[PDB]
Amino acid sequence: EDDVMEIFNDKTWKLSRITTEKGKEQFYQGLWSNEAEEKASRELLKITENFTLNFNCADVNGEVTGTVSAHAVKANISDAILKIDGKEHTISISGKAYGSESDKLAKVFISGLFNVFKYEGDVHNLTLYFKDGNTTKVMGFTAR
Amino acid sequence: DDVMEIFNDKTWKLSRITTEKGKEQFYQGLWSNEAEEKASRELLKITENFTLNFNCADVNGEVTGTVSAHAVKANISDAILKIDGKEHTISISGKAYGSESDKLAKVFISGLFNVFKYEGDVHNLTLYFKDGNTTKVMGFTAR
């Protein structure tokens, strides 16, 4: 079960891609409507603190629990309820984001995190599988 | 905030087991003779003996903060932890694996399941526990 606690081990997961289940492209087709929208999202993605994900342990209700926190651009996920199983490689994030997003990449990032169902990863990489309607997409992350 | 520093990549090493406001390292009557105390102090010099660790673990599909400890021959593995940073309370529940013959090891294991409150900083941790009608303290250090 050390594979699960390596996800919490003093690291911030930075978004690197949002694509289809077995796609080689960085972003799935139709995420943006034009080049200017994509360009503006890519500039927001270059900012260090934007599109981050953190697995932390916190003292909630007189007991320490593992939760998920994330920051897109203007919206935050703070101490979302986490279910994670190292044997079955399943994951579930429950709660609601604080703040609203105008950027399409930020909207996809926040919605996708609450729809995660399974994952895979190592020390430096994390892949989260999420359902987007009838499809299955993946959010890729990196940790320095 | 202060609570998660107790879990921050550190092992707590036992330094003393004494009375609530006592200056002595070990309370009077812990051992019956000089040879018993000497033998316990040699077991206490071993790095891996009388250690305490606050860790996060995936227990039944969810990550929880737990307590682990090693005395000499006995272990406490992922004991259920209740801890409150505001009121500085603490509770450790479960049972140790293995039996102890050493009196310091018996006191260490029993005392950990009877903790009720604490205080500490980056390098020091003090756990208050009830021993019958009395209140004793276990002191720890982290390098």
CSV table of C-alpha atoms in Angstrom, one decimal:
chain,number,residue,atom,x,y,z
A,1,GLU,CA,0.0,0.0,0.0
A,2,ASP,CA,3.1,2.4,-0.2
A,3,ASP,CA,2.1,3.1,-3.9
A,4,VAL,CA,-0.9,5.1,-2.5
A,5,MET,CA,1.1,7.0,0.1
A,6,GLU,CA,3.7,8.0,-2.5
A,7,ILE,CA,0.8,10.1,-4.0
A,8,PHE,CA,0.6,12.1,-0.6
A,9,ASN,CA,4.4,12.2,-0.1
A,10,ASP,CA,5.3,16.0,-0.1
A,11,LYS,CA,4.3,16.8,-3.7
A,12,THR,CA,2.1,19.0,-5.8
A,13,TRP,CA,0.6,17.3,-8.9
A,14,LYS,CA,0.7,19.6,-11.9
A,15,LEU,CA,-1.7,19.1,-14.8
A,16,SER,CA,0.1,18.0,-18.1
A,17,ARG,CA,-2.8,16.8,-20.3
A,18,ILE,CA,-6.6,16.1,-20.6
A,19,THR,CA,-7.1,13.5,-23.4
A,20,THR,CA,-9.0,10.4,-24.5
A,21,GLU,CA,-8.5,7.0,-22.8
A,22,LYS,CA,-5.7,5.8,-25.1
A,23,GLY,CA,-5.0,9.1,-27.0
A,24,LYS,CA,-1.4,10.4,-27.7
A,25,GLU,CA,-2.5,14.1,-28.0
A,26,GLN,CA,-2.1,16.5,-25.1
A,27,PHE,CA,-5.7,17.8,-25.2
A,28,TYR,CA,-8.8,16.0,-26.7
A,29,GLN,CA,-10.4,17.3,-29.9
A,30,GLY,CA,-13.2,19.9,-29.2
A,31,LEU,CA,-11.9,21.1,-25.8
A,32,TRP,CA,-11.7,24.7,-27.2
A,33,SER,CA,-13.6,26.3,-30.2
A,34,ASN,CA,-10.7,28.3,-31.7
A,35,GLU,CA,-6.9,28.9,-31.5
A,36,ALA,CA,-7.3,32.1,-29.3
A,37,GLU,CA,-9.2,30.2,-26.6
A,38,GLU,CA,-6.5,27.4,-26.6
A,39,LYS,CA,-3.7,30.0,-26.5
A,40,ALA,CA,-5.2,31.8,-23.5
A,41,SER,CA,-5.7,28.5,-21.6
A,42,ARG,CA,-2.1,27.5,-22.4
A,43,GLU,CA,-0.9,30.8,-20.9
A,44,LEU,CA,-2.9,30.2,-17.7
A,45,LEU,CA,-1.5,26.6,-17.6
A,46,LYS,CA,2.2,28.1,-17.6
A,47,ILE,CA,1.4,29.8,-14.2
A,48,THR,CA,3.0,27.5,-11.5
A,49,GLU,CA,0.1,27.7,-9.0
A,50,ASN,CA,-2.7,27.0,-11.7
A,51,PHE,CA,-4.1,23.5,-12.4
A,52,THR,CA,-2.5,21.9,-9.3
A,53,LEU,CA,-3.7,18.8,-7.3
A,54,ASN,CA,-2.7,17.9,-3.8
A,55,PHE,CA,-3.4,14.8,-1.7
A,56,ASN,CA,-3.1,15.8,1.9
A,57,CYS,CA,-3.7,14.6,5.4
A,58,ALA,CA,-5.7,17.0,7.7
A,59,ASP,CA,-7.2,17.0,11.2
A,60,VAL,CA,-11.0,16.9,10.3
A,61,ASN,CA,-13.5,16.5,13.2
A,62,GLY,CA,-10.9,15.4,15.8
A,63,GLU,CA,-9.3,12.7,13.5
A,64,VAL,CA,-6.7,12.8,10.7
A,65,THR,CA,-8.1,11.9,7.2
A,66,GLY,CA,-6.7,12.0,3.7
A,67,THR,CA,-8.4,14.5,1.4
A,68,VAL,CA,-8.0,16.1,-2.1
A,69,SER,CA,-7.4,19.8,-2.8
A,70,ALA,CA,-7.0,21.3,-6.2
A,71,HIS,CA,-6.7,24.7,-7.8
A,72,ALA,CA,-7.7,25.4,-11.4
A,73,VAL,CA,-7.5,29.2,-12.1
A,74,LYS,CA,-10.3,31.1,-10.2
A,75,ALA,CA,-11.9,28.0,-8.6
A,76,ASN,CA,-10.7,25.8,-5.7
A,77,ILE,CA,-11.4,22.3,-4.4
A,78,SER,CA,-10.7,22.3,-0.6
A,79,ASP,CA,-10.4,19.1,1.4
A,80,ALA,CA,-12.8,17.1,-0.9
A,81,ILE,CA,-13.8,13.7,0.5
A,82,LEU,CA,-11.5,11.0,-0.9
A,83,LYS,CA,-12.0,7.3,-1.4
A,84,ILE,CA,-8.8,5.5,-2.8
A,85,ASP,CA,-7.9,1.8,-3.0
A,86,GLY,CA,-4.3,0.8,-3.7
A,87,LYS,CA,-5.2,-2.8,-4.5
A,88,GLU,CA,-8.0,-2.1,-7.1
A,89,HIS,CA,-6.5,1.3,-8.1
A,90,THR,CA,-9.9,2.9,-7.7
A,91,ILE,CA,-10.5,6.6,-6.7
A,92,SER,CA,-13.5,8.8,-5.9
A,93,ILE,CA,-13.5,12.6,-5.2
A,94,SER,CA,-16.7,14.1,-3.7
A,95,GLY,CA,-17.7,17.7,-2.9
A,96,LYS,CA,-18.1,21.0,-4.7
A,97,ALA,CA,-15.7,23.6,-6.0
A,98,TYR,CA,-15.5,27.1,-4.5
A,99,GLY,CA,-15.7,29.8,-7.2
A,100,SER,CA,-16.7,29.8,-10.8
A,101,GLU,CA,-14.6,29.3,-14.0
A,102,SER,CA,-14.8,31.1,-17.3
A,103,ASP,CA,-11.8,29.3,-19.0
A,104,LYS,CA,-12.8,26.1,-20.8
A,105,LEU,CA,-9.7,24.1,-19.6
A,106,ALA,CA,-10.4,25.2,-16.0
A,107,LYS,CA,-14.1,24.1,-16.4
A,108,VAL,CA,-13.0,20.7,-17.7
A,109,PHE,CA,-10.4,20.3,-15.0
A,110,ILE,CA,-12.8,21.0,-12.1
A,111,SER,CA,-15.7,18.8,-13.5
A,112,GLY,CA,-13.4,16.0,-14.4
A,113,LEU,CA,-11.9,15.7,-10.9
A,114,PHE,CA,-15.3,15.1,-9.3
A,115,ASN,CA,-16.0,12.3,-12.0
A,116,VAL,CA,-12.7,10.3,-11.4
A,117,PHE,CA,-13.3,6.5,-10.9
A,118,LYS,CA,-9.8,4.9,-11.3
A,119,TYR,CA,-6.1,5.8,-11.6
A,120,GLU,CA,-2.5,4.7,-12.2
A,121,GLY,CA,0.8,6.3,-11.3
A,122,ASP,CA,4.4,6.2,-10.1
A,123,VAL,CA,6.7,8.6,-8.1
A,124,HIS,CA,6.6,11.4,-10.9
A,125,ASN,CA,3.4,10.6,-12.9
A,126,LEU,CA,-0.3,10.3,-12.0
A,127,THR,CA,-3.1,9.4,-14.5
A,128,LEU,CA,-6.8,9.9,-13.4
A,129,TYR,CA,-9.6,8.2,-15.4
A,130,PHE,CA,-12.9,10.1,-15.3
A,131,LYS,CA,-16.3,9.7,-17.0
A,132,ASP,CA,-17.5,12.6,-19.3
A,133,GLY,CA,-21.0,11.5,-20.2
A,134,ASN,CA,-20.8,8.2,-22.1
A,135,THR,CA,-17.0,8.6,-22.7
A,136,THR,CA,-13.9,7.9,-20.5
A,137,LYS,CA,-11.1,10.6,-20.6
A,138,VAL,CA,-7.8,10.9,-18.7
A,139,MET,CA,-6.1,13.7,-16.8
A,140,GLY,CA,-2.4,13.4,-16.7
A,141,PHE,CA,-0.2,15.0,-13.9
A,142,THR,CA,3.5,15.4,-13.1
A,143,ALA,CA,5.3,15.9,-9.8
A,144,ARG,CA,8.9,17.3,-9.6
B,1,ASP,CA,-1.4,22.9,11.4
B,2,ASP,CA,0.6,22.0,14.6
B,3,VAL,CA,-0.9,18.4,14.4
B,4,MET,CA,0.5,17.6,10.9
B,5,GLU,CA,4.1,18.5,12.1
B,6,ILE,CA,3.9,15.4,14.4
B,7,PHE,CA,3.5,13.3,11.1
B,8,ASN,CA,6.2,15.3,9.1
B,9,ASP,CA,8.9,12.7,8.1
B,10,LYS,CA,10.0,12.0,11.6
B,11,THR,CA,10.3,9.1,14.1
B,12,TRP,CA,9.7,9.9,17.8
B,13,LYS,CA,12.3,8.3,20.1
B,14,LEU,CA,11.4,7.7,23.8
B,15,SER,CA,13.5,9.9,26.2
B,16,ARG,CA,11.6,9.5,29.5
B,17,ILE,CA,8.6,8.0,31.4
B,18,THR,CA,7.9,10.1,34.6
B,19,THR,CA,5.3,11.7,36.8
B,20,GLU,CA,3.1,14.6,35.6
B,21,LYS,CA,5.6,17.4,36.8
B,22,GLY,CA,8.6,15.3,37.7
B,23,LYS,CA,12.2,16.3,36.7
B,24,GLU,CA,13.5,12.6,36.9
B,25,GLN,CA,13.9,10.5,33.7
B,26,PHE,CA,12.0,7.5,35.0
B,27,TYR,CA,9.4,7.5,37.8
B,28,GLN,CA,10.3,5.7,41.1
B,29,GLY,CA,9.2,2.0,41.2
B,30,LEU,CA,9.4,1.4,37.4
B,31,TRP,CA,12.1,-1.3,38.1
B,32,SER,CA,12.7,-3.4,41.3
B,33,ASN,CA,16.6,-3.4,41.2
B,34,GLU,CA,19.7,-1.9,39.5
B,35,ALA,CA,20.2,-4.9,37.1
B,36,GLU,CA,16.6,-4.6,35.7
B,37,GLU,CA,17.1,-0.8,35.1
B,38,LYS,CA,20.6,-1.4,33.5
B,39,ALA,CA,19.2,-4.0,31.1
B,40,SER,CA,16.3,-1.7,30.1
B,41,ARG,CA,18.7,1.2,29.5
B,42,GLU,CA,20.8,-1.0,27.1
B,43,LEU,CA,17.6,-1.9,25.2
B,44,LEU,CA,16.8,1.8,25.1
B,45,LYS,CA,20.2,2.6,23.4
B,46,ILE,CA,19.2,0.5,20.4
B,47,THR,CA,18.0,2.9,17.6
B,48,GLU,CA,14.9,0.9,16.5
B,49,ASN,CA,13.6,0.3,20.1
B,50,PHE,CA,11.0,2.5,21.9
B,51,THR,CA,10.0,4.4,18.7
B,52,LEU,CA,6.7,6.0,17.8
B,53,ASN,CA,5.4,7.1,14.3
B,54,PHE,CA,2.4,9.1,13.3
B,55,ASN,CA,1.6,8.0,9.7
B,56,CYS,CA,-1.1,8.2,7.1
B,57,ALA,CA,-2.3,4.8,5.7
B,58,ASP,CA,-5.0,3.4,3.2
B,59,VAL,CA,-7.3,1.6,5.7
B,60,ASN,CA,-10.3,0.0,4.0
B,61,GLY,CA,-10.6,2.2,0.8
B,62,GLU,CA,-9.8,5.5,2.6
B,63,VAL,CA,-6.6,7.2,3.9
B,64,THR,CA,-6.6,7.8,7.7
B,65,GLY,CA,-4.0,9.0,10.2
B,66,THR,CA,-2.8,6.2,12.5
B,67,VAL,CA,-0.2,5.4,15.2
B,68,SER,CA,2.6,2.8,15.0
B,69,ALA,CA,5.1,2.0,17.7
B,70,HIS,CA,7.9,-0.4,18.5
B,71,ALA,CA,9.0,-1.2,22.0
B,72,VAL,CA,11.4,-4.2,22.0
B,73,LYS,CA,9.7,-7.5,21.1
B,74,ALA,CA,6.1,-6.0,20.7
B,75,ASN,CA,4.7,-3.7,18.0
B,76,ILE,CA,1.7,-1.4,17.7
B,77,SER,CA,0.7,-1.3,13.9
B,78,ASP,CA,-1.7,1.3,12.6
B,79,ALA,CA,-3.6,1.8,15.9
B,80,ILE,CA,-6.8,3.9,15.5
B,81,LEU,CA,-5.9,7.6,16.3
B,82,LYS,CA,-8.1,10.4,17.6
B,83,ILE,CA,-6.2,13.7,17.9
B,84,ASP,CA,-7.4,17.3,18.3
B,85,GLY,CA,-5.0,20.2,17.7
B,86,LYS,CA,-7.3,22.8,19.3
B,87,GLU,CA,-7.9,21.1,22.7
B,88,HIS,CA,-4.5,19.1,22.4
B,89,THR,CA,-6.3,15.8,23.2
B,90,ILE,CA,-5.2,12.4,21.9
B,91,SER,CA,-6.5,8.8,22.0
B,92,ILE,CA,-4.8,5.6,20.7
B,93,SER,CA,-7.0,2.4,20.4
B,94,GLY,CA,-6.1,-1.2,19.5
B,95,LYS,CA,-3.8,-4.0,20.8
B,96,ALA,CA,-0.1,-4.7,20.6
B,97,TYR,CA,1.3,-7.6,18.6
B,98,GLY,CA,3.7,-9.7,20.6
B,99,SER,CA,4.5,-9.9,24.4
B,100,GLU,CA,7.1,-8.0,26.4
B,101,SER,CA,9.3,-9.3,29.3
B,102,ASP,CA,11.2,-6.0,29.9
B,103,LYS,CA,9.4,-3.7,32.5
B,104,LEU,CA,10.2,-0.5,30.5
B,105,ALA,CA,8.7,-2.1,27.3
B,106,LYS,CA,5.6,-3.2,29.3
B,107,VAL,CA,5.1,0.4,30.6
B,108,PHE,CA,5.7,1.9,27.1
B,109,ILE,CA,3.1,-0.3,25.4
B,110,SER,CA,0.4,0.0,28.2
B,111,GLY,CA,1.0,3.7,28.5
B,112,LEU,CA,0.4,4.4,24.8
B,113,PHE,CA,-3.1,2.9,24.8
B,114,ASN,CA,-3.9,5.1,27.9
B,115,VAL,CA,-2.9,8.5,26.4
B,116,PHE,CA,-5.5,11.2,26.8
B,117,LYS,CA,-3.7,14.6,26.0
B,118,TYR,CA,-0.4,15.9,24.7
B,119,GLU,CA,1.9,18.8,24.0
B,120,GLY,CA,4.9,19.3,21.7
B,121,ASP,CA,6.9,21.2,19.1
B,122,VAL,CA,9.1,20.3,16.1
B,123,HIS,CA,11.7,18.3,18.1
B,124,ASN,CA,9.8,17.3,21.3
B,125,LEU,CA,6.5,15.4,22.1
B,126,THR,CA,5.0,14.8,25.5
B,127,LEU,CA,2.1,12.3,25.9
B,128,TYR,CA,0.0,12.3,29.1
B,129,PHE,CA,-1.5,8.9,30.1
B,130,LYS,CA,-3.5,7.5,33.0
B,131,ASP,CA,-1.8,4.7,35.1
B,132,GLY,CA,-4.7,3.7,37.4
B,133,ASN,CA,-5.5,6.8,39.6
B,134,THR,CA,-2.3,8.6,38.6
B,135,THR,CA,-1.2,10.7,35.5
B,136,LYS,CA,2.2,10.0,34.0
B,137,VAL,CA,4.1,11.4,31.0
B,138,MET,CA,6.0,9.8,28.2
B,139,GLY,CA,8.6,12.2,26.6
B,140,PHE,CA,9.9,11.8,23.0
B,141,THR,CA,12.5,13.4,20.8
B,142,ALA,CA,12.7,13.7,16.9
B,143,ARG,CA,16.0,14.4,15.2
